[PDB]
Amino acid sequence: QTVRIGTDTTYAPFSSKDAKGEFIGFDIDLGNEMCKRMQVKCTWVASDFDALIPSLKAKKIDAIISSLSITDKRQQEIAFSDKLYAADSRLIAAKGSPIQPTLESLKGKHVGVKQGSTQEAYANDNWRTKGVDVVAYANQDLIYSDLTAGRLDAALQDEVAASEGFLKQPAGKEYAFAGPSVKDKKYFGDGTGVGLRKDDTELKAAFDKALTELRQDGTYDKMAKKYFDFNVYGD
Template identity: 50%
Template sequence: MKKTIATLSLLLLTASPFAGAADWSGKVLRLGVDPTYPPLEYKNPNGQLAGFGIDIAEALCAELHAKCLWVESSWDGIIPALLARKIDAIASSMTITPKRMEHIAFTNRISNAPTRLVARRGSPLIPTAESLAGKRVGVEQGSSQEAYAKAEWGTKGVEIVSYQNQDQVYADLTVGRLDASLQGSIQASYGFLDKPAGKDFEFAGTTLQDDKFFGVGDGIGLRKEDVELREDLNKALATILANGTYARINKKYFDFDIYGAQ
């Protein structure tokens, strides 16, 4: 599955801030994050960023001897922010999909969070267009779940309602404005179903699998031209997987292996 300042060296005479930067020591990476997706990225009661994705990104920055500067963004605005150079990478848990890869690049897989439908406990709903016809399903704007729901269900009588963040989806689900919500299963488990607000809800049906929309897992999003940064982040990822840092962070948040979660 997400804190200081500075500037990075230029690539091809200012084409990219990461040109030829073999040494990241003391440099700053501006990492975009949507902190509304616990336990991957969220704010703790003290208002500090926390979560699996935050800790993993900090560990990667530590391997590069760089500093993380966190930049909060709505999910639907995070890729535009990257392309506009307002941030250097998307450190939230972003699903690696073919459509997104048309515009940006990704590191190797960092985690895997399958998609599932959530509905009120005892509901007969399952994640099919036939079952959901005439129902309202909430999704987060800019998410792979939104893309899937609109393409596969929205043309078949299902009303897809998009929200700026996941907290808003759950708020409307609990008061009955939505019949179901579609999101990553890990976020749903730890961020809603295990909380008091989610006590009357449960997963409905099985995991959705469609590589066109849900890709091969989650990674850090980057501009395509920032090849060296991607390579260095991949090396750092391999290091924390090998030296036990990844496993330690995984254990802090989950009782299963999120790297290969299904």
């Protein structure tokens, strides 16, 4: 009757907190709208990103809505709803930096990634092994802070989150994307979705039906235009 939804609230404009601590963003909007149509009450539960899937398995939450990319490896552990939106990854660095998302360019440099994320996996496999100082952070706010402090040369995260939550904000005015999106289907998955226990067939079916329903009547686009002047859903 209650659905507990875990989210990492340091990933604007998808999941973050306003000045009085209330959860805000597109993930929150999608979650609340789906639960409205499911006719369920929903409790939001703030969590570090890397604790979300462990908390879901332990039954401390019932769903994850936290820009959780749908990947082959994660599907071995949990189930996913249908796609909520697309999520490409992209590097950011200081404006005018020559940095590229390449080993040759990042060797010896300090690159921040969120612990537990697809970006940490990609960076650990392709960069950390090979001499890039990949630094793994409990949350994304610590990454932005350490980047602006000049402790990081660059940071890898979801492209829309970096753009709307940092680059277009006053904090990130002197920073820019370094190179194009990092395209690696294996690592970064096929968009984001609601993360669910594999046996929670009924819950997944309910989320899927509300999501189709709010996409069909135009509610998705209404909510998306609050944050985005582009097609965040993808293909």
